[PDB]
Design a protein around this nucleic acid. Structure first.
Lengths: 72, 169
RNA sequence: UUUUUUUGAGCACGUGA
């Protein structure tokens, strides 16, 4: 099928619990919480490339990045 | 004694930025964290704030405890040593006498342990009790002792069967 | 089932805009 609209970006900055992503096919720098990341966070760092869906946070209407994974 | 504080009754919408700022007026801060649901991020309504110095830690209580922030009166207390011994200490007490007061709970529950928080629920439209309360002891066995000691008994005044369970959730 | 939420993956750049 075709429904989940995923796009790509680079890790711009990381904190202990969340990070920020420069979007490749979108002029935007999105927030994301480690809840949305899959597997080994312990070795993820600035510059790693990632795929994700831009959503808006259900709680706080903020633009965010959801269901984030790496491809590296 | 220690430098770690617990802050209670935070408004939902309070954030780390905002809390930090408020407390940074007292002195320098090592760590400051609002507790939230990992998956949705909603605030559990409490936070830990660790001051650099025992001075500032203590002062913060003196000053900030009780201040109002968006119709919520904060409670800045010392963070006790956490772990397994603190779990299961919140009691849902019911069938108290309607005429119950605050001092009366210190009497009824004081000897079984030191109390952290207590609230007598009132029907605010009346302002007078529903005959229901909460009592949170320090350590687990204090609560457990009080459960067995008071469950199904008549109070030292009223004439009805108490119910003292652990609080749900 | 409380001022819903008192012991711990900073849910907005880690810090008094």
């Amino acid at each position: 099928g075709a429904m989940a609209t995923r796009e790509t970006g680079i890790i711009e900055k990381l904190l202990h619990s969340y990070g920020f992503i420069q979007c490749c096919e979108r002029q935007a720098r999105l927030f994301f919480h480690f809840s949305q990341f899959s597997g080994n966070i312990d070795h993820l760092k600035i510059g790693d490339p990632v795929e994700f869906e831009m959503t808006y946070d259900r709680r706080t209407g903020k633009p965010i990045a959801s269901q984030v994974s790496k491809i590296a | 004694s220690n430098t770690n504080l617990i802050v209670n009754y935070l408004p939902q919408d309070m954030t780390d930025r905002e809390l930090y700022a408020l407390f940074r007026a007292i002195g320098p801060i090592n760590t400051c964290r609002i507790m939230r649901d990992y998956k949705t991020g909603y605030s559990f309504g409490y936070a830990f704030v660790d001051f650099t110095s025992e001075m500032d830690s203590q002062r913060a209580i003196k000053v900030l405890n009780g201040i109002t922030v968006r119709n919520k009166r904060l409670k800045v207390s010392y963070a006790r040593p956490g772990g397994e011994s603190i779990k299961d200490t919140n009691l849902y007490v019911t069938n108290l006498p309607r005429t119950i007061t605050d001092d009366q709970l210190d009497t009824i529950f004081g000897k079984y342990g030191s109390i952290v928080q207590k609230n007598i629920l009132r029907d605010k439209l009346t302002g007078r009790p529903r005959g229901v309360a909460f009592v949170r002891y320090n350590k687990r066995e204090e609560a457990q002792e009080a459960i067995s000691a008071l469950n199904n008994v008549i109070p030292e005044g009223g004439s009805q069967p108490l119910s003292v369970r652990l609080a749900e959730e």
